[PDB]
Design a protein around this ligand. Structure first.
Ligand code: ZN
Ligand code: ZN
Ligand code: ZN
Lengths: 118, 105, 59, 43, 99, 56
RNA sequence: CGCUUCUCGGCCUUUUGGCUAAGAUCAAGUGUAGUAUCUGUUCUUAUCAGUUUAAUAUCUGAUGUCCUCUCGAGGAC
């Protein structure tokens, strides 16, 4: 919802909130043309440690909890969560239990590739 | 292989069980990823030949149809001594192509 | 103003001046305490006439 | 490929080359090449 | 949308070929259609498109007209010499600074 | 489309306008006539149908 | 010798056969990975100290003592 209104970046003095804003590039990852997807994915992989775990997961996991998740969207989000996991190495220690609480269902599901991913 | 650097090999001790490739992938070397001069046979790790995986395409994961060989180069530089080349990660490519399939049709 | 000239005939951008290290001064006692601006000029000067003449004056 | 001898820049397409000619890079190089040339002449 | 490269190729193609064979022209660039070329040229590219800010008198005329002939921009825009796009957005802008 | 090429010696332009007016009027009158044929059913053709459509 | 006009030689310019319904007509594969090039945009702060670098850089931080004028200034130190 935040992305609907607009406000200047400096006025977004909570520069972590600036971070959140620009993080909602997630939407571009979710819906968007293949080039949007690629560029966004590179963006996030390399700005990962710059962003930090807290924001990233606090704004990812709600998505994965969506009842209205389709297939593509899901496998996309797991792609990203994987790539950022490969950058943030330790910083996840506070966030493990959250990560499991969401990934676990992939362990028991009729899709094959979903099982192997999770 | 030399083409997707995100891929991994088993890298345990080789054994005595020969390796086999799908009809799809067949005709190539596993590492130098060429298509020529097969010299010597592949051998795979005990685990990587356990279970249902008796006779599977090392790369494609599918049905064993033929034997898997080593190019003259790889056997000249002795890249053929690193144990199971069994790829223990499926890789993004198969997943994503199947997913886009299920989407489209 | 406060930056060197070039073949264009006008001064160089201040970031180019910093990037090439032209803000760093190197002194050579053998050259009569002459000050060279930046690492490239200070590497070339060992082959330049002023340093060769200083070495010749020392025998 | 297309080269600008004034800027020492490579251009892939003919479209890229024409777009390079309208640039702060091309124009500033053209203007600097300009003023320097004018000053540089002499019973 | 249009990128400056396609734009330049358009300029050159038009000045060579004349305004009448848009099929050949659009054949040139990929992912561009003859209808689009025609539209863009007459809308933005062609030199006769006067690109400056609105005089006070021009805005007087605009406002007065758009009050005289509601929502007919392709009828108005010739009368003040700009495109329908210019007349449209700029009237929007005047209306917003007023309110 | 108003064709107006300025540098023409006016008498030459006078001629050209006389002649284009002749030809265009001929064009029209033959269009009137062919369409009356086609409406009267008199004859068929795959050209004098498309041609007359265009002119009309 | 001056003027003027005409003849020629040396030659530094453009130069497709037309009418017809502008004759008619008017193509783009997809995905995954990575690089290159353009267009675009921006740094003059002084020290010091730190971080970091091959070296800059970067990035981080703060602007001899006392009084007063308006970071500057005067003096007793
Ligand atoms: Zn090989
Ligand atoms: Zn193995
Ligand atoms: Zn296979």
């Amino acid at each position: 919802d935040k992305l609907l209104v607009d406000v200047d970046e400096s006025t977004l003095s909570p520069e972590e909130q600036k971070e959140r804003k620009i993080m909602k590039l997630l939407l571009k990852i979710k819906n968007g043309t293949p080039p949007m997807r690629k560029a966004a994915l590179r963006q996030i992989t390399d700005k990962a440690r710059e962003f930090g775990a807290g924001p990233l997961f606090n704004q990812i996991l709600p998505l994965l909890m969506s009842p209205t998740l389709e297939d593509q969207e899901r496998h996309l989000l797991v792609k990203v969560i994987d790539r950022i996991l490969y950058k943030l190495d330790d910083l996840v220690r506070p966030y493990v239990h959250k990560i499991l609480v969401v990934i676990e269902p992939l362990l028991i599901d009729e899709d094959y590739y979903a099982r192997v991913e999770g | 292989a030399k083409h997707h650097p995100d891929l991994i090999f088993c890298r345990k001790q080789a054994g005595v069980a020969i390796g086999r490739l799908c009809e799809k992938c067949d005709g190539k070397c596993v590492i130098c990823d060429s298509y020529v001069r097969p010299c010597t046979l592949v051998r795979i790790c005990d685990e990587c030949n356990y279970g249902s995986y008796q006779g599977r395409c090392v790369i494609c994961g599918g049905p064993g149809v033929s034997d898997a060989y080593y190019c003259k180069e790889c056997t000249i530089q002795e890249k053929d001594r690193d144990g199971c080349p069994k790829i223990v990660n499926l890789g993004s490519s198969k997943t994503d192509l199947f997913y886009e399939r299920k989407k489209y049709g | 103003k406060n930056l060197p000239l070039g073949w264009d005939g006008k001064p160089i951008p201040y970031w180019l001046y910093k990037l090439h290290g032209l803000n760093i001064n190197y002194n050579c006692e053998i050259c009569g305490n002459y000050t060279y601006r930046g690492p490239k000029a200070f590497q070339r000067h060992f082959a330049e006439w002023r340093h060769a003449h200083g070495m010749r004056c020392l025998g | 490929s297309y080269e600008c001898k004034l800027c020492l820049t490579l251009h892939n397409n003919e479209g890229s080359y024409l777009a390079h000619t309208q640039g702060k890079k091309h124009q500033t190089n053209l203007a600097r090449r300009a003023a320097k040339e004018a000053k540089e002449a002499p019973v | 949308v249009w990128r400056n490269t396609e734009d330049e190729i358009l300029k050159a193609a038009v000045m060579k070929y004349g305004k009448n064979q848009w099929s050949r022209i659009a054949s040139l660039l990929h992912r561009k259609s003859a209808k689009q070329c025609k539209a863009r040229w007459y809308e933005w590219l062609d030199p006769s498109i006067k690109k400056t800010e609105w005089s006070r008198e021009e805005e007087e005329k605009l406002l007065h007209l758009a009050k005289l002939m509601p929502t007919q921009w392709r009828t108005i825009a010739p009368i003040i010499g700009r495109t329908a796009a210019q007349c449209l957005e700029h009237y929007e802008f005047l209306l917003d600074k007023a309110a | 489309i108003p064709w107006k090429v300025p540098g023409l010696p006016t008498p030459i332009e006078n001629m050209i306008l006389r002649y284009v007016k002749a030809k265009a009027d001929w064009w029209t009158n033959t269009a009137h006539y062919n369409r009356e044929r086609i409406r009267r059913g008199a004859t068929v053709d795959k050209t004098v149908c498309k041609k007359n459509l265009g002119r009309l």
